[PDB]
Design a protein around this ligand. Structure first.
Ligand SMILES: CC(C)CCC[C@@H](C)[C@H]1CC[C@H]2[C@@H]3CC=C4C[C@@H](O)CC[C@]4(C)[C@H]3CC[C@]12C
Ligand SMILES: CC(C)CCC[C@@H](C)[C@H]1CC[C@H]2[C@@H]3CC=C4C[C@@H](O)CC[C@]4(C)[C@H]3CC[C@]12C
Ligand SMILES: CCCCCCCCCCC(C)(C)C(=O)Nc1c(OC)cc(OC)cc1OC
Ligand SMILES: CCCCCCCCCCC(C)(C)C(=O)Nc1c(OC)cc(OC)cc1OC
Lengths: 416, 416
């Protein structure tokens, strides 16, 4: 019915000790060194001198004070008002006569809080202040994580209070402020927080892995520059040939697959692991081997098991017993769908589109491969889907960048 | 003083059972499936129908009857006349009075045999019949292997006869015809042949790995087509910009590194292993982990340990005690040098050049990195060297293909 946190170490950290995968990692970072050397040489050729401009990151992270102010107000809101609302509701529930009306009132209050304060704020800051595209993504990912963990907090703390008031003890098991402040930075996503912990904080370890994140970000940056610039920077003498389109979906796979592997590694492994060992909770793995995945169910099961666990437990179970319809084969097909749309939302704000190639891509993916060789099929479909989504998104982004076309129903499909 | 053949299995065959490297292999073959699908789609777009032309292999393997006739005469020569010459020399040596003059006579006879019959034949077939470029490579690699194994045969069988005639026994330990015919197809390169053997012949195994070779060859083919065509097919509106050159040496690394990895795998692992288990001698590994290589000595030590063992034993030891000079630090720097030149020769015949970028590349490599982070330096230098050699060779090949310029001292360096 619940989840057990066991203190096993991260999978990739245990696996990276073997010398072969060690050499794969060294090959990756040698490729990065080659990238930076090629970039410095190209800059020294083009400008003659004065290397290391770093222009794309300056354009993508422009209004950074606005972003950090938005994050400050976001964090203080999601830290203060849900806790205070739950305190008031628990007191008014356990104190006096029939609180079912009061319970529905507080439930509406929390619903409007989450919806208003955590959609309107984060979404309308973007649509009002006209942020850079990458600076929208950080705050929208933050709002998604915050609403997920707030819903987790409430859904975990409701039934305990319910059963304790049914037992009718004045000692209401309300959570404290410090453990909530801890969970707000926890790498997990369920309010049953890191009661299993780590003994000490290896500061060399956290420094190494945080610098690893800081390096992987520049690896993403150099990948974007050296591959997404030559393939996409306004080669728009429109042939509309299927040859050019298939060559884009071919040539964008290497940047696509490198970005996917690298961002998996960076974000999950070292980002979370830095905020794990810095927070004394490195006591849970957050991804099994997603390459060892023949069927689709397993692939979703062990890619970013944080999101998978949150979605599975809360969405699957609660949203399932709420319906228990005659067609329960969609028990996953439903949640993935909204997952799709939330990813669509994640690509709706920062891209200023709604072009749902990820949505229909996921639908074709699932409805085609739900009905060892399966591992090869999974890898080839992953390459092709990654490549097509990357080429389509970059192509539409630069085609709308070509002409502003001043409701965005499928724009820039014609080369402007 | 000698070598011991132990029946340990191939390294990569034992390592490929682990599921992670298994997934790397499946990723590779899924990439190949994506390659062939992209090629069929591009052909169906360009021609409208009538897929699967296979033109480049028809041009590269044109005069195949001539190649197989050359190989037949090569094999029958190197199978008959060295054996007969050694028989006659051993008999005339152990039979009668002072054979030092006769021994020098037979030594000159074998020297002229190897030099004439195994340079002139194979090299002058090429320079007379004007073979396709890839069909030169098969016969020149065959002549190199044949001269190496013939020299091995003679250098192993001389001292045994010497010591046996010093002991003065009429039973001269001459080798038989069948074991020589076996060694001529043996995967090893030392005449101390596969006395350790395998019990049986797994025909499913040899069929699978031979089909694996046949697939890896097409993987090389599709790599060449989809990457070396767009980057190199006569984009010759000469800027002579350092930017275009560094972008070539950058963009040719992925085809370069894929070709190197794949050809290592294909040729060594499955080619040799098919001719190992089909010949009842899979009782020796022929490469350790060359990725786990920090220093240069180890890298050369365990890349294609067949050639390394032949060179090391015969060249190193014999050519070393023949000089034992005051500067013996070149004990490796010498042999590698001739190795370089033989590779240069391997790239002198089939490329119709002598452009020695591999030679000076190897020299800079060694003289710069002889004096974990070393693993990264090795990988980045390997990427850069592979890329520069591939771009230079393809560029010069296509630039000489542009205009024939009808002694080839550094041609096509100007864009024709
Ligand atoms: C059918 C054809 C395409 C198969 C091609 C197989 C090639 C791509 C694969 C199969 C097994 C692989 C090797 C297995 C493990 C390692 C250890 C790592 O530290 C470096 C890469 C290296 C050395 C791999 C390189 C590429 C490799 C040799
Ligand atoms: C400093 C930055 C560049 C490091 C980037 C590290 C990335 C490229 C590396 C480090 C460890 C690697 C993983 C280790 C082993 C495997 C198992 C194999 O079956 C699939 C690839 C996979 C999943 C690797 C993918 C790429 C990987 C995650
Ligand atoms: C830009 C080229 C494509 C790169 C792909 C990865 C980009 C960073 C994604 C980061 C994020 C959002 C956390 C994530 O992993 N996404 C994700 C997931 O977790 C919510 C679950 C999931 O189900 C199997 C599939 C998912 O992506 C398909
Ligand atoms: C075309 C792009 C570059 C691809 C590189 C591999 C091509 C096939 C080579 C096949 C062959 C000749 C057998 C070989 O492995 N060469 C080789 C070697 O053995 C003799 C020893 C050696 O010393 C460390 C270095 C060697 O190559 C640098």
């Amino acid at each position: 019915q619940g989840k057990i946190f066991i203190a096993r170490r991260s999978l990739l950290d245990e696996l990276l000790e073997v010398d072969h995968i060690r050499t794969i990692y060294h090959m990756f970072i040698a490729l990065l060194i080659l990238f930076i050397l090629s970039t410095l040489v190209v800059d020294y050729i083009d400008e003659g001198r004065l290397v290391l401009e770093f222009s794309l990151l300056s354009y993508a992270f422009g209004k950074f004070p606005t972003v950090v102010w938005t994050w400050w107000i976001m964090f203080l809101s999601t830290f203060s008002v849900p806790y205070f609302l739950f305190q008031h509701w628990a007191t008014g529930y356990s104190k006096s006569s029939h609180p079912l009306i009061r319970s529905l009132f507080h439930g509406f209050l929390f619903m409007i809080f989450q919806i208003g304060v955590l959609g309107f704020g984060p979404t309308y800051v973007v649509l009002a202040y006209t942020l850079p595209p990458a600076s929208r993504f950080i705050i929208i990912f933050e709002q998604i994580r915050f609403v997920m963990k707030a819903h987790s907090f409430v859904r975990e703390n409701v039934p305990r209070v319910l059963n304790s008031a049914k037992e009718k003890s004045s000692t209401v098991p309300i959570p404290t402020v410090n453990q909530y402040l801890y969970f707000l930075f926890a790498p997990t996503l369920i309010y049953r927080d890191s009661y299993p912990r780590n003994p000490t904080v290896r500061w060399g370890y956290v420094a190494m892995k945080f610098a690893q994140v800081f390096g992987c970000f520049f690896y993403v940056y150099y990948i974007f520059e050296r591959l997404c610039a030559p393939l996409f920077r306004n080669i728009k003498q429109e042939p509309f040939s299927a040859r050019v389109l298939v060559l884009c979906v071919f040539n964008s796979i290497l940047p696509g697959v490198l970005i996917l592997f690298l961002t998996f590694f960076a974000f999950l492994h070292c980002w979370l692991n830095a905020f794990a060992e810095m927070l004394r909770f490195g006591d849970r793995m957050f991804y099994k081997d997603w390459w060892n995945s023949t069927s689709y169910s397993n692939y979703y099961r062990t890619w970013n098991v944080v999101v998978h666990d949150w979605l599975y437990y809360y969405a699957y179970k609660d949203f399932l017993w709420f319906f228990s319809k005659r067609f329960k084969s969609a028990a996953m097909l439903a949640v993935f769908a909204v997952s799709a749309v939330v990813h669509e939302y994640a690509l709706a704000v920062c891209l200023s589109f709604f072009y749902p190639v990820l949505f229909v891509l996921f639908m074709f993916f699932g409805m085609a491969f739900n009905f060892p060789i399966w591992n090869v099929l999974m890898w080839t479909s992953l390459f092709l889907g990654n490549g097509v989504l990357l080429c389509f998104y970059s192509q539409e982004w630069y085609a709308r960048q070509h002409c502003p076309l001043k409701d965005y129903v499928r724009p820039r499909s014609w080369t402007c």
